[PDB]
């Protein structure tokens, strides 16, 4: 079929009409991107070279555009000498247009022929011919060959220097001729010669149109060949200070931005000081804006430590004065970059005198808040989002100013005109997500803004409603007030979309307000339309209801606690049934079902453990004293059937922790928050395991003290902080009670019950990968043995070997590198005796690295067994930093095994 | 960068499943 | 010798800017690593010494990342699984020290005792 398409396109080429010839020629790139077969590519390219050697110049332009489009397949071309011989053989024509087209095609073939001396020579000769269109085509071809070669670059730099000094050709051709010197980053001496040439060029031609391209090529040359970055920076600062052309100064802006973004650590203190003096001495607001953007980028980078590295007060440093005056300048963008500089320097450096800068920065910050709150322009909203970035960065870096900045943002919530409110609601949601006290400090005013929403907004009511409901949940992280949620329901039933109120419900499930979540899921359940949607909402409703029941818990009451556990477990059972109902072959809720099943099993283990804790007093010490002597107990020191059940519970909990590790390593696709949350659940399980192991079982053999750092507030969630504090509490209690009592477990059961009660008092946090999933990556992993279309086993002679030829192609549902980028694929293959040491001899694994998104690997299996065997493979996708991440299909192939009749006869004779 | 990184509330980020739910539930557009 | 002078200047920059935040140390190390790698590609006679100092800085960055791992923040008795970027770092850092000792041609005992 591919061959069929090939020669029918060849017949279209052999057709008389140049229209149809153009048709087939421009049809080739589709065939290249359909059939990557290299012999087909080579033959198609050879026919292209033939028709280009004899075509009527419009076919030639079509072939040129075909090459320039499907450039990426060029590297798999075999008959390079013949292809280049035709394409170069049409350059002796007298038609300047044909010569120009041919030279452009040589510029396109630069990827496969970068050494052709005759091509070099033809380009260099046509570079100083007179026909205009071929002169600019020669310039383009030199611009490509100088990129993928070096000796051609030194020839062209000599020729270009000669031409520019030789004064022929007009200024437009000089503009075309300058940018060749960007590709001079192959050696330092070429770089220095070109640098001297460019300095001479700028001093020789003081024109704006000259200087702009000269400076831009010079700076790309230095940024590539990063040896003369200080000379580049000081030259640019000279031209920013001295040259009065405003456009040239804007070039200096947009170039120092590039240098600051690429190589920040090369920026020096005198460079910063000179730029600061220029930014003070400038009269123009726009150029000051550009310089302030440059200083903002440099302040965000590391170079602020260079500027404030000692071996002159920081206040005596000229940067601070400029930053302050421009933050309090009238113009909005100038103020935005000033407060950016202030935020960056405050978070970055910590000296004794910077507290005044902190206060100045925060006060100018609410200045920007009021200005952007009542400006209502697109640029105003951009500067507003900049200010909110400053907020998040300042509050996270320094927790000292948190209460002040939150109350200022609440005053702006009073004083806003319902456009910026969504943005600062997101920002203050972040800030309260870090520090919890910011919500229960001022619960009331956010509810007041919530009640004025309905007659306050008309356009993005849904968006601001969702945001402010998110932050009211964050504020009422504790038990939500019935009156407050009734008001919420009143406004939602007044004006809301179903998708809107669904998003409020999802945020409620995220934070942990499960009663409100239950109500919203009940309403959405009563509407819905479709079946898996109904079952999904119903399951969510049941988990919200069970979590409500779990939050309905009393401290130090074990009977009521186990009753609540039983009720919540009934409701998870209903929910998990409805979740399996929602499950479909498409979008299969694997993570969701498995995670909620593991939560179910954790709570079942908790109920069993507290039941055995209560049954500790069910005469187990009496059974031990009746079966054996209490003194020097034969089964155990203070032996117990209860201790046997403790051993069972410890092993069960460890298995549960292993399943959590399995769930995480099979998930692999979630973000940092969700993966962290699963790690915390496994942390809780292992905490219970270590507690029951180090307290009920042998404490002398335990001998474990938590002599390590714990309790730091580097967490990403208040939920995480709460579980971590519970962990610290349990560790300190078990470390206190490690050696106090005998194994009869007098108050050991009380300590375990306290740990259980705390771990269930911290409710839950339903999370993002349990909800909307991103970076859906997959491995197809098609093996290619002898093809077993049915389940018929594959016969092998069993005397030689067997080859496998496994293949895998990786696919991505979106931008693949959202969180984790695939690096290597550890395939793992093993055998098993299907007809019953389980054929675990061949335990191969191979780490193939996919250079492209397709890979293949050959495996050899050896076996001399009569029976059928199953062969299993695994993907073991291992990421950039290096993690196991057990994902992949794990497919199996049946293999038969028969033997030679001559071999069987010889064995019978044996 | 955006104002808040852990933002579940954004349009183009959300995937196919509750895109279909969005289509249905925007068609519905009310709660009792 | 602009290339040699620049290499010396970048190395002394790192040596002087040692006394700062672990995060800023991480970005400075990454920047200088890709810088010296670019120089080793760029020239030929400085390629060996450039790559040698570059893999030494990679060594140091690897150890600092292993120290700044959150395992130390988390309490001792847990040590869950798969967070052992510290352990993978230890294996890679030992292999790089062996490589850095033997695959290179000119090494003197000052460098050798630094390696050890």
Q: In this complex, do A773 and B15 lie within 8 Å of one another by their Cβ atoms?
A: yes
DSSP-H helix ranges across A128-170: 132-145, 151-166
Total number of residues shown for chain C: 116
Q: Are A762 and A870 in contact (CB under 8 A)?
A: no
Question: Who contacts A523 (Cβ-Cβ below 8 Å, separation ≥6)?
Answer: A501, B31, B32
Please report residues of B whose CB lies closer than 8 A to that of A470. Answer: 9
Residue A762 CA to residue A760 CA, distance in Å, equals: 5
Residue A872, strand partner residues: A830, A892
Residue A190 CA to residue A192 CA, distance in Å, equals: 5
Integer CA distances (angstroms), A219 to A214, A231, A232, A233, A353, in order: 9, 10, 7, 9, 38
Instruction: Tell me the torsion sign for CA atoms A196, A201, A204, A207.
Output: negative
Measure CB to CB from residue B3 to each of A426, A774, A813 and give the nearest one. A426
Question: Who contacts A763 (Cβ-Cβ below 8 Å, separation ≥6)?
Answer: A512, A514, A547, A550, A551
Q: In this complex, do A385 and B22 lie within 8 Å of one another by their Cβ atoms?
A: no
Q: In this complex, do B25 and A426 lie within 8 Å of one another by their Cβ atoms?
A: no
In angstroms, what is the resolution? 4.6
Most C CBs within 10 Å: which of A882, A884, A887, as the mutation test of the C interface?
A882
Measure CB to CB from residue B17 to each of A385, A389, A587 and give the nearest one. A587
Measure CB to CB from residue B31 to each of A463, A493, A776 and give the nearest one. A493
Residue A317, strand partner residues: none
Please report residues of B whose CB lies closer than 8 A to that of A527. Answer: 28, 30-32
Coil/strand/helix, residue B2:
coil
Q: In this complex, do B28 and A529 lie within 8 Å of one another by their Cβ atoms?
A: yes
DSSP-H helix ranges across A374-434: 378-397, 402-415, 421-434
Q: In this complex, do A813 and B15 lie within 8 Å of one another by their Cβ atoms?
A: yes
Q: Are A2 and A8 in contact (CB under 8 A)?
A: no
Residue A659 CA to residue C81 CA, distance in Å, equals: 12
Q: In this complex, do A683 and C80 lie within 8 Å of one another by their Cβ atoms?
A: yes
Q: In this complex, do A498 and B30 lie within 8 Å of one another by their Cβ atoms?
A: yes
Chain B stretch 1-32, residues whose beta carbon is closer than 8 A to a beta carbon of chain A: 1-9, 13-18, 20-22, 24-32
Q: Are A86 and A49 in contact (CB under 8 A)?
A: yes
Please report residues of B whose CB lies closer than 8 A to that of A501. Answer: 31
Q: Are A508 and A520 in contact (CB under 8 A)?
A: yes
Residue A45 CA to residue A63 CA, distance in Å, equals: 10
Q: Are A802 and A829 in contact (CB under 8 A)?
A: no
Residue A901 CA to residue A415 CA, distance in Å, equals: 94
> Which of A357, A368, A359, A291 lies closest to A335, judged by CA?
A368
Q: Are A248 and A208 in contact (CB under 8 A)?
A: yes
Q: Which chains pack against A, by 3+ Cβ pairs within 8 A?
A: B, C
Residue C69 CA to residue C5 CA, distance in Å, equals: 35
Please report residues of A whose CB lies closer than 8 A to that of B28. Answer: 498, 527, 529
Q: In this complex, do A264 and C82 lie within 8 Å of one another by their Cβ atoms?
A: no
Integer CA distances (angstroms), A157 to A146, A189, A193, in order: 9, 12, 9
Total number of residues shown for chain B: 32
For chain A, the residues before each gap (C–N > 2.5 Å) are: 311, 836
Q: In this complex, do C28 and A302 lie within 8 Å of one another by their Cβ atoms?
A: yes
Q: Structure tokens of A783?
A: 């093996």
Q: Structure tokens of A908?
A: 């019978």
How many alpha carbons fall within 13 Å on the CB side of residue A886? 13
Question: How distant is the Cα of A489 from the closest Cα of chain B, in angstroms?
Answer: 10
Number of CB pairs, chain A paired with chain C, less than 8 A apart: 78
Coil/strand/helix, residue B6:
coil
Q: In this complex, do B8 and A773 lie within 8 Å of one another by their Cβ atoms?
A: no
Please report residues of B whose CB lies closer than 8 A to that of A433. Answer: 6
Question: How distant is the Cα of A637 from the closest Cα of chain C, in angstroms?
Answer: 26
Count of CB atoms situated within 10 Å of the CB of A541? 24
Elucidation method: cryo-EM
Q: In this complex, do A185 and C42 lie within 8 Å of one another by their Cβ atoms?
A: yes
Q: Which chains pack against B, by 3+ Cβ pairs within 8 A?
A: A
Please report residues of B whose CB lies closer than 8 A to that of A499. Answer: 21-22, 25-26
Residue with tokens 């909307």: A772
Measure CB to CB from residue B24 to each of A466, A493, A529 and give the nearest one. A529
Kindly give the interhelix angle for A558-582 and A748-761, rounded to the nearest 10 degrees: 40
Q: In this complex, do A772 and B8 lie within 8 Å of one another by their Cβ atoms?
A: yes
Most A CBs within 10 Å: which of C6, C32, C78, C91, as the mutation test of the A interface?
C78
Most A CBs within 10 Å: which of B2, B4, B13, as the mutation test of the A interface?
B4
């Amino acid at each position: 079929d591919a061959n069929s398409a090939l020669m029918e396109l060849d017949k279209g080429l052999r057709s008389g009409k140049l229209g149809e010839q153009c048709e087939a020629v421009v049809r080739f790139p589709r065939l290249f991107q359909k059939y990557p077969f290299p012999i087909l590519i080579n033959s198609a390219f050879l026919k292209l070279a033939d028709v280009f050697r004899v075509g009527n110049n419009f076919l030639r332009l079509c072939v040129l555009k075909v090459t320039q489009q499907s450039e990426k397949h060029l590297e798999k071309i075999l008959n390079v000498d013949e292809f280049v011989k035709r394409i170069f053989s049409v350059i002796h024509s007298n038609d300047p247009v044909a010569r120009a087209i041919t030279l452009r095609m040589l510029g396109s073939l630069a990827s496969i022929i970068p050494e052709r001396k005759n091509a070099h020579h033809s380009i260099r000769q046509s570079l100083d011919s007179h026909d205009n269109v071929e002169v600019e085509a020669a310039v383009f071809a030199a611009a490509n060959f100088s990129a993928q070669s070096k000796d051609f670059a030194v020839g062209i730099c000599n020729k270009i220097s000669e031409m520019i000094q030789g004064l022929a050709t007009p200024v437009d051709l000089k503009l075309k001729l300058i940018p060749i010197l960007q590709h001079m980053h192959h050696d330092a001496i070429l770089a220095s010669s070109a640098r001297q040439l460019l300095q001479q060029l700028v001093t020789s031609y003081p024109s704006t149109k000259m200087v702009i391209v000269s400076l831009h090529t010079f700076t790309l040359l230095a940024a590539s060949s990063l040896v003369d970055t200080p000379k580049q920076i000081q030259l640019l600062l000279q031209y920013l200070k001295n040259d009065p052309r405003k456009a040239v100064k804007r070039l200096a802006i947009q170039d120092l931005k590039l240098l600051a973004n690429k190589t920040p650590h090369t920026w020096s203190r005198e460079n910063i000081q000179a730029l600061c003096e220029c930014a003070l001495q400038t009269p123009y607001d726009s150029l000051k804006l550009g310089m302030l953007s440059v200083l903002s980028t440099l302040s965000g980078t590391i170079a602020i430590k260079h500027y404030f590295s000692i071996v002159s007060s920081p206040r005596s440093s000229d940067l601070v004065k400029l930053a302050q005056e421009c933050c309090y300048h009238n113009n909005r963008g100038i103020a935005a970059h000033g407060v950016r500089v202030l935020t960056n320097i405050t978070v970055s450096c910590q000296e004794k005198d910077l507290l005044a800068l902190e206060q100045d920065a925060v006060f100018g910050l609410e200045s920007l808040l009021v200005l952007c709150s009542q400006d209502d322009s697109p640029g105003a909203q951009a500067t507003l989002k900049i200010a909110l970035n400053c907020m998040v960065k300042l509050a996270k870096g320094r927790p000292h100013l948190s209460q002040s900045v939150v109350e200022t943002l609440l005053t702006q919530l009073h004083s806003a005109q319902d456009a910026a409110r969504i943005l600062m609601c997101h920002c203050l949601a972040a800030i309260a997500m870090q520090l919890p006290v910011l919500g229960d400090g001022m619960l009331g005013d956010l509810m007041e803004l919530y009640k004025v929403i309905g007659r306050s907004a008309t356009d993005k009511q849904q968006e601001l409603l969702v945001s402010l409901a998110t932050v009211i949940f964050v504020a009422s992280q504790k038990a939500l007030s019935v009156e407050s949620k009734a008001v919420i329901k009143q406004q939602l039933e007044s004006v809301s979309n179903g998708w809107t109120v669904y998003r409020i419900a999802r945020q409620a499930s995220r934070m942990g307000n499960h009663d409100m979540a239950k109500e919203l899921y009940q309403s959405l359940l009563t509407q819905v339309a479709s079946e898996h949607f109904y079952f999904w909402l119903n399951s969510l409703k049941e988990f919200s209801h069970a979590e409500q029941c779990l939050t309905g818990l009393q401290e130090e009451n074990y009977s009521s606690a186990l009753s609540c556990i039983a009720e919540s477990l009934k409701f998870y059972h209903k929910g998990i049934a409805s979740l399996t109902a929602a499950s479909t072959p498409l979008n299969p809720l694997s993570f969701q079902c498995e995670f909620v099943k593991l939560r179910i099993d954790l709570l079942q283990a908790f109920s069993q453990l507290i039941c055995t804790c209560n049954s500790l007093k069910t005469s187990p010490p009496p059974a031990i004293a009746t079966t054996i002597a209490m003194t020097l107990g034969n089964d155990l020191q203070r032996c117990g059937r209860i201790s046997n059940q403790m051993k069972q519970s410890m092993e069960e909990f460890r298995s549960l922790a292993s399943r959590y590790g399995d769930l995480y390593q099979a998930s692999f696709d979630a973000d940092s928050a969700t993966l962290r949350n699963v790690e915390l659940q496994q942390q809780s399980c292992l905490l219970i395991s270590h507690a029951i192991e180090a307290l009920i079982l042998d404490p002398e053999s335990a001998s474990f003290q938590e002599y390590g750092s714990t309790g730091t507030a580097h967490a990403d969630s208040e939920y995480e902080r709460r579980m971590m504090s519970v962990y610290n509490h349990v560790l300190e209690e078990v470390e206190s009670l490690n050696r106090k009592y005998t194994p009869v477990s007098y108050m050991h059961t009380a300590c375990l019950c306290n740990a259980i009660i705390a771990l269930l008092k911290v409710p839950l946090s339903f999370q993002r990968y349990f909800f909307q999933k991103l970076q859906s990556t997959s491995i197809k992993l098609a093996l290619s043995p002898s093809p077993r279309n049915p389940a018929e086993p594959i016969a092998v002679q069993n005397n030689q070997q067997l080859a496998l030829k496994v293949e895998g192609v990786v696919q991505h549902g979106s931008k693949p590198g959202l969180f984790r980028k695939i690096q290597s694929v550890c395939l793992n293959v093993s055998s098993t005796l299907q007809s019953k040491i389980d054929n675990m001899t061949n335990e191969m694994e191979q780490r193939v690295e996919p250079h492209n998104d397709y890979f293949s690997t050959q495996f050899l299996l050896n076996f001399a067994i009569l029976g059928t065997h199953n062969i299993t493979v695994e993907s073991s996708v291992k990421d950039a930093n290096g993690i196991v991440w057990k994902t992949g299909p794990r497919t199996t192939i049946f293999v038969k095994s028969l033997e030679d009749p001559y071999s069987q006869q010889i064995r019978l004779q044996q | 960068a955006h104002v808040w990184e852990d933002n579940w509330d954004d349009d183009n980020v959300e995937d196919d499943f509750s895109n279909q739910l969005r289509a249905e539930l925007e068609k519905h557009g009310y709660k009792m | 010798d602009p290339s040699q002078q620049f290499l010396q200047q970048s190395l002394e920059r790192v040596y002087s800017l040692q006394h700062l935040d672990p995060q800023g140390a991480q970005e400075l190390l990454e920047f200088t690593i890709r810088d010296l790698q670019r120089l080793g590609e760029l020239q030929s006679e400085l390629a060996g010494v450039a790559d040698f100092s570059a893999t030494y800085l990679r060594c140091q960055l690897l150890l600092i990342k292993a120290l700044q791992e959150k395992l130390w923040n988390v309490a001792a008795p847990l040590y869950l699984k798969q967070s052992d970027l510290a352990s993978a770092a230890a294996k890679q850092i030992m292999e790089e020290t062996y490589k850095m000792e033997f695959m290179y041609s000119g090494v003197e005992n000052k460098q050798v005792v630094i390696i050890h």
